[PDB]
Amino acid sequence: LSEGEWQLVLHVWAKVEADVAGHGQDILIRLFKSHPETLEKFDRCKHLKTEAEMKASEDCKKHGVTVLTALGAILKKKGHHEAELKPLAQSHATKHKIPIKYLEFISEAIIHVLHSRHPGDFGADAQGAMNKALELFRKDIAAKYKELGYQG
Ligand code: HEM
C-alpha cells in the first residue's frame, strides 16, 4: 500500500475509534445477517434470536470489540504486523478453525458498516485503500494458515 493509501485507511479508522463498541456490534450483526453460517462460531451469540438481544449482550458485543481492537493495531502497523498476525493465525487456524472465506465475509461487513456510517470519509478511493489493507491482512493470514498445516 502507498503512504497515501495508508493515510486513507487510518483516516477512516480514526472514525471507528470514536465509537468502537458501536462499530463492533454493527459489524457482527451485519456479518450474521449476510452470512448466518458464521454465527455457529460464536458461543455467546449463537443462541440469541434478535438483533436487539445481540446489541444488548455484553458477551456478544465482546468479539465485536475484540476484532476491531486487534484489526486496529494491525492496520496501524501499516503492513509490518508479523508479531500481531502470527498469534492471530495460530488461534484462528488451530483453535477457532476460521476459513479464509469467513475472513472475506467479515471484511465485507467492515466495509459495509464504514460506508454506512461514514459515506463522506469513505468514497471510492478510501474504499479501495481499505480493500487493499484487508486483502493484505487476508493474504498474510492465509500464508500463516498453510505454514501451520491448515488449508482453510
Ligand atoms: C478481522 C478479522 C479478525 C480479527 C482481527 C480477529 C481477532 C480476534 C482476536 C484478537 C481474538 C481473541 C484472541 C484470539 O483468539 O486470537 C479472536 C477470537 C475469536 N475469533 Fe476472531 N478475529 C477475526 C475474524 C474472525 C472471524 C471471521 C471469526 C468467525 C466468524 C472469528 C472467530 C473468533 C472466535 C470464535 C474467537 C474466540 C472467541 C473470542 O475470544 O471472542 N474471528 N478474534
UniProtKB/Swiss-Prot annotation:
What molecular functions are annotated in GO for this chain?
A: heme binding; metal ion binding; nitrite reductase activity; oxygen binding; oxygen carrier activity; peroxidase activity
Could you mention a single GO BP entry for this protein? removal of superoxide radicals
Domain Globin, residue spans? 1-146
Q: Where does nitrite bind?
A: 63
Q: Keywords for this entry?
A: Cytoplasm, Heme, Iron, Metal-binding, Muscle protein, Oxidoreductase, Oxygen transport, Phosphoprotein, Transport
Residues that coordinate or bind O2: 63
At what positions is Phosphothreonine found?
A: 66
Signal peptide location: none
Q: What class of enzyme is it?
A: oxidoreductase
Binding-site list for heme b: 92
Give the EC number(s) listed in the UniProt record: 1.7.-.-, 1.11.1.-
Major localisation: cytoplasm
What positions are modified (Phosphoserine)? 2
Q: What binding partners and quaternary form does the record give?
A: Monomeric.
Which family would the database say this protein is a member of? Belongs to the globin family.
Name of this chain's protein: Myoglobin
Query: Which species expresses this protein natively?
Result: Physeter macrocephalus (Sperm whale)
Gene it is expressed from: MB
